[PDB]
Design an enzyme around this catalytic site. Structure first.
Site, PDB file in Angstrom:
ATOM      1  N   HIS A  22       0.835  -1.205   0.000  1.00  0.00           N
ATOM      2  CA  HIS A  22       0.000   0.000   0.000  1.00  0.00           C
ATOM      3  C   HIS A  22       0.859   1.240   0.000  1.00  0.00           C
ATOM      4  CE1 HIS A  22      -3.893   2.146   1.273  1.00  0.00           C
ATOM      5  NE2 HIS A  22      -2.968   3.082   1.140  1.00  0.00           N
ATOM      6  N   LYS A 136      -8.746  -1.000  -5.749  1.00  0.00           N
ATOM      7  CA  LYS A 136      -8.757  -0.255  -4.487  1.00  0.00           C
ATOM      8  C   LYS A 136     -10.144   0.335  -4.228  1.00  0.00           C
ATOM      9  CE  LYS A 136      -7.520   2.546  -1.003  1.00  0.00           C
ATOM     10  NZ  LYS A 136      -6.351   3.489  -1.154  1.00  0.00           N
ATOM     11  N   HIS A 168      -9.524   0.981   1.918  1.00  0.00           N
ATOM     12  CA  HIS A 168      -9.328   2.023   2.887  1.00  0.00           C
ATOM     13  C   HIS A 168     -10.462   1.887   3.916  1.00  0.00           C
ATOM     14  CE1 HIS A 168      -8.670   6.425   4.010  1.00  0.00           C
ATOM     15  NE2 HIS A 168      -9.915   6.240   4.411  1.00  0.00           N
ATOM     16  N   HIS A 197      -5.362   0.009   6.462  1.00  0.00           N
ATOM     17  CA  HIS A 197      -5.237   0.981   7.553  1.00  0.00           C
ATOM     18  C   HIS A 197      -5.639   0.341   8.884  1.00  0.00           C
ATOM     19  CE1 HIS A 197      -4.510   3.548   4.258  1.00  0.00           C
ATOM     20  NE2 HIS A 197      -5.710   4.081   4.105  1.00  0.00           N
ATOM     21  N   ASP A 200      -4.500   1.402  12.539  1.00  0.00           N
ATOM     22  CA  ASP A 200      -5.021   2.634  13.139  1.00  0.00           C
ATOM     23  C   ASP A 200      -5.789   2.325  14.423  1.00  0.00           C
ATOM     24  OD1 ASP A 200      -3.957   4.324  11.242  1.00  0.00           O
ATOM     25  OD2 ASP A 200      -5.859   4.673  10.197  1.00  0.00           O
ATOM     26  N   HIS A 221       0.116   1.821   7.951  1.00  0.00           N
ATOM     27  CA  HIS A 221       0.289   3.199   8.406  1.00  0.00           C
ATOM     28  C   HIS A 221       1.430   3.323   9.420  1.00  0.00           C
ATOM     29  CE1 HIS A 221      -3.754   5.472   7.425  1.00  0.00           C
ATOM     30  NE2 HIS A 221      -2.969   5.319   6.371  1.00  0.00           N
ATOM     31  N   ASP A 268       2.258   3.406   3.438  1.00  0.00           N
ATOM     32  CA  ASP A 268       1.302   4.368   2.859  1.00  0.00           C
ATOM     33  C   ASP A 268       1.971   5.721   2.644  1.00  0.00           C
ATOM     34  OD1 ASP A 268      -1.152   5.298   1.835  1.00  0.00           O
ATOM     35  OD2 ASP A 268      -1.957   5.733   3.827  1.00  0.00           O
TER      36      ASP A 268
END
Ligand SMILES: C[As](C)(=O)[O-]
Ligand SMILES: C[As](C)(=O)[O-]
Ligand SMILES: [Zn+2]
Ligand SMILES: [Zn+2]
Ligand SMILES: [Zn+2]
Ligand SMILES: [Zn+2]
Lengths: 331, 329
Positions: A22, A136, A168, A197, A200, A221, A268
């Site tokens: 990513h 995506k 995402h 992600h 997170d 991330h 990312d």
């Protein structure tokens, strides 16, 4: 089967090697780079910055990145091909739609969207003949009606071609559960899907439950952190204030629970970023001067220090992306 | 000063002739025509449809159109140049922003926007060297904070270059008043500004008041009257319930008030339209098979029979656009 599309053409999956699953060359908007290149200094300046960064990532061991920029993220695959060739790093391009679709996309049906994603996979992007190797998609916490069309079209394109889907999410909203439900209602195998992600959040119950269903978990991330930048509202809102070590320990956490085969790791990162506040790129580059080399230079040793076997790390950075990207379904 | 930039290069004011001041080759989205040309059948098919349409309008007397498609309406100036050259009709391209800016635009400051509009006017659009000859802006009734930034950036670009500003309004909400207030706060002369879609209202007092302040009044939705489509659930919020004749009489009304110098007339037509529901182009073409020739073929004769003299009609369709488009400070 055992070949995947890159912006320089098809390669065998053995050639992919260490893959970052990513990333972005430039995070922008449809048409924007070509209409206003001096937002980035110049197109040449941007290309040179990406080549410098990709070359450093290659030195550090990276052999492939997946650029998950869609049409509405201002994907310019001609730029991707130029910098791939000059850095000699494989780049896999994406189709799909992110969070900023223009009216000409927002008003389309699920059938129309399916044919757009299939064109970019099966025929080529724009008039370049470069074909996408991944789809995506992006949702807000609660999926909107349009976003649900996008996810169903993505599933349908994936079932017709074998290429995978990557998402995402808002991990703090457990966004992956609603995405997974839509995907499975379309008959899509979880093994074709990466929930992105996911670092997170610190909710390991949410993460492990997706992993147990066969989803790939995108811990992508890892270098995003505005610690020290608390006085910067925009940067704090974007990067969060959890440390990169905190994010990376989730990699260890999922390994310790027995799910190393479900982990995908990335930065990312990007070399230009117009779809946020001005000069956000300079802030990000001061946080993480390693750029895309952050994973092999900082994270991998951090994890080896914590006692994770080399073979396990190689499996996560080489074997897992290979299994994920290889087209797997209808011949 | 007396040169107007078109997609084939500069022309003199006298070369412009009969000019339609609010038109589109293709209403789309940034990047969309390039990324999905088969939405329109093919790029070739769209080009060929536009060349036939422009040639028809040319045979009805049109010599120039102003394509007010912005970046976010998917303006493709290479397409405009192609179709202009094949139809022998001048096309003036636009900068500015319409109602669908992407994040990379929506997050910009007024200073940043001003520079982007200036680049498209002074340097060129993309890498084509084709320069914009007008600035297009749009607002919805009560101007949003971002739309206010766009209007101010448009005023500043106009003031630096002499190029005029033309607007999209909700006429039923009297949206031109708010636009004018913002333009005047910037020190922009009303004579550089066309308030568009103004035939969407019957409020003649609203229009006369703007004209008296020196604004140009864009009566450009005349054939968007439809008539007959109340079964459609997407052709009543775009098209009208008032006849085209009713709209056309606003032209006469303003002439009679002594403001013929303030009037600009157009069709707001297009040959492809992706920023709406699928198949809308078929609906539109069946309602108005004249396309961009509707103004010269239906509205001009209708005004003539209502007693408007040739000289006045030529003033509106030739003289007024020339004065408007000629860069002036
Ligand atoms: C282009 As992004 C900030 O959604 O990873
Ligand atoms: C492109 As339009 C329908 O706002 O004139
Ligand atoms: Zn994302
Ligand atoms: Zn991303
Ligand atoms: Zn309009
Ligand atoms: Zn228009």
């Amino acid at each position: 089967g055992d070949r995947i599309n890159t912006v320089r053409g098809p390669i065998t999956i053995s050639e992919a090697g260490f893959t970052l699953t990513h990333e972005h060359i430039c995070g922008s908007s449809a048409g924007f780079l070509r209409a206003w290149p001096e937002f980035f200094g110049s197109r040449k300046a941007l290309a040179e910055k990406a080549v410098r960064g990709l070359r450093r990532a290659r030195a550090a061991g990276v052999r492939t990145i997946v650029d998950v920029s869609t049409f509405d993220l201002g994907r310019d695959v001609s730029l991707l091909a130029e910098v791939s060739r000059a850095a000699d790093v494989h780049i896999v391009a994406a189709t799909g739609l992110w969070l900023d679709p223009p009216l000409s996309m927002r008003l389309r049906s699920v059938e129309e969207l399916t044919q757009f994603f299939l064109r970019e996979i099966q025929y080529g992007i724009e008039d370049t003949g470069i074909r996408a190797g991944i789809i995506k998609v992006a949702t807000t916490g609660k999926v909107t009606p349009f976003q649900e069309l996008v996810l169903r079209a993505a599933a349908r394109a994936s079932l017709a071609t074998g290429v995978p889907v990557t998402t995402h999410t808002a991990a703090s909203q457990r966004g992956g559960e609603q995405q997974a439900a839509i995907f499975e209602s379309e008959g899509l195998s979880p093994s074709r899907v990466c929930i992105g992600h996911s670092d997170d959040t610190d909710d390991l119950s949410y993460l492990t439950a997706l992993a147990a269903r066969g989803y790939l978990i995108g811990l992508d991330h890892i270098p995003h952190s505005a610690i020290g930048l608390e006085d910067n509202a925009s940067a704090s809102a974007l990067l969060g204030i959890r440390s990169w070590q905190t994010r990376a320990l989730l990699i260890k956490a999922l390994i310790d629970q027995g799910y190393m085969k479900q982990i995908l790791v990335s930065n990312d990162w990007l070399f230009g970023f117009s779809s946020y506040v001005t000069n956000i790129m300079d802030v990000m580059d001061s946080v993480n001067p390693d750029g895309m080399a952050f994973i092999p230079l900082r994270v991998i040793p951090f994890l080896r220090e914590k006692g994770i076997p080399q073979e396990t790390l190689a499996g996560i950075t080489v074997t897992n992306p290979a299994r994920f990207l290889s087209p797997t379904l209808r011949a």
